């Protein structure tokens, strides 16, 4: 029984430790905020849409022109961390969802712009 309690204390130590370690969820989320701001790319893409409208019109005109207690405390701390980790799984899922829709929009917008630029380049080539 003393050996079993020692093994339990060792494993709760390891458990709290790994829980802290996962609590990486921060470097992931902080950077996801960083890249979220970077994808908010969208500003440049909107500006290109306006400016390709302008290019269309201009170029169209161009063409026209003791041991128990430690177990208890370690479990306490493991619970605290694990609760917080659950929050992080939930929020990371949410943020990935929102960024996924945003990236899909960025995707289609960029290719549309690419096509419009190839169009305008080809129609400039003949003038």
């Amino acid at each position: 029984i003393k050996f079993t309690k020692q093994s339990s204390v060792a494993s709760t130590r390891n458990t709290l430790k790994m829980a802290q370690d996962a609590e990486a969820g921060m470097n992931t989320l902080g950077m996801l905020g960083h890249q979220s701001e970077q994808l908010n790319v969208e500003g440049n893409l909107d500006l290109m849409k306006v400016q390709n409208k302008v290019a269309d019109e201009k170029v169209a005109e161009l063409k026209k022109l003791e041991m128990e207690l430690e177990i208890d405390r370690n479990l306490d701390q493991i619970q605290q961390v694990s609760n917080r980790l659950k929050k992080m799984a939930l929020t990371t899922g949410k943020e990935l969802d929102s960024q996924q829709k945003r990236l899909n929009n960025i995707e289609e917008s960029t290719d549309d712009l690419d096509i419009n630029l190839h169009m305008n380049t080809n129609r400039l080539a003949g003038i």
Binding site: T28, Q38, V41, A55, I106, T110
Partner: protein
Amino acid sequence: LFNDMEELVIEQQENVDVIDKNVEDAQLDVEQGVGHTDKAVKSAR
């Protein structure tokens, strides 16, 4: 799971850098091009 997620997100950092840079270069090149077509329209008139 955290390891797999963080490492993959480490990978995605370059994609985000490259996308920001590429779209930024494109925007400036389009701006210059539109300016050139503007001057061209001014001349043909």
